[PDB]
């Protein structure tokens, strides 16, 4: 992650919000089903992120339409927070890496394998960052009773 922008701040706030504190008055009820949804729907999320004009609306609609059950009314805050973090991370990633990717691909000396090692996809990198943050939250929160 890049500590330059508000993505780092939102990441820290998400960790603070959805990580359980020790018994003492209530937390924000982290949901673990979103972890596997992001992994499974990663390519669809990439398609949504690549849509510049309707990115936020498409992300919100996708999360609402996938998590459309009665239980999910309590996880609207989590959905909104992860949507904001994903959008911020994608914007930072494109700003940092777009021209770098174009110039790396246009280079003729570098081999294809080294090109693919050097080239990073902004949308997929942001999705992986969200996935790793949620996995860390779940790892801290869960205990084998």
Partner RNA sequence: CGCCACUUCAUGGAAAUAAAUCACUCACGAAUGUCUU
User: Which residues lie near RNA (CB under 7 A)?
Assistant: 31-33, 35-36, 66-69, 71-72, 138, 142, 144
Please identify, using beta-carbon distances, which residue of 86 and 137 lies nearer to RNA.
137
Q: Give the nearest distance from C-beta 28 to RNA in angstroms.
A: 13
Give whole-number Cα distances, 34 to 55, 78, 127, 134, 135, in Å: 19, 9, 12, 8, 10
Structure tokens at 90: 């994608």
Contact 50, 123 (CB under 8 A): yes
Contact 56, 87 (CB under 8 A): yes
**Three-class SS state of 48:** helix
Please identify, using beta-carbon distances, which residue of 115 and 138 lies nearer to RNA.
138
Q: Give the nearest distance from C-beta 74 to RNA in angstroms.
A: 10
> Among 38, 132, 51, 37, which residue's Cα sits nearest to residue 90?
51
Q: Give the nearest distance from C-beta 79 to RNA in angstroms.
A: 11
Please identify, using beta-carbon distances, which residue of 9 and 71 lies nearer to RNA.
71
Please identify, using beta-carbon distances, which residue of 9 and 40 lies nearer to RNA.
40
Residue with tokens 């990663």: 42
Q: Give the nearest distance from C-beta 118 to RNA in angstroms.
A: 28
């Amino acid at each position: 992650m890049s500590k330059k922008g508000k993505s780092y701040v939102k990441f820290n706030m998400l960790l603070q919000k959805y990580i359980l504190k020790n018994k003492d008055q209530e937390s924000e009820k982290f949901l673990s089903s979103v972890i596997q949804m992001i992994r499974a729907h990663a390519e669809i999320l990439q398609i949504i992120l690549q849509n510049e004009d309707k990115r936020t609306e498409m992300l919100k609609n996708y999360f609402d339409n996938n998590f459309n059950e009665s239980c999910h009314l309590g996880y609207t805050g989590l959905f909104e927070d992860i949507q904001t973090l994903l959008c911020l991370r994608y914007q930072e990633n494109i700003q940092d890496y777009q021209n770098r990717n174009e110039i790396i691909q246009q280079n003729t000396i570098l081999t294809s394998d080294e090109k693919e090692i050097l080239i990073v996809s902004p949308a997929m990198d942001a999705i992986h960052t969200i996935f790793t943050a949620l996995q860390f939250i779940h790892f801290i929160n869960y205990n084998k009773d």
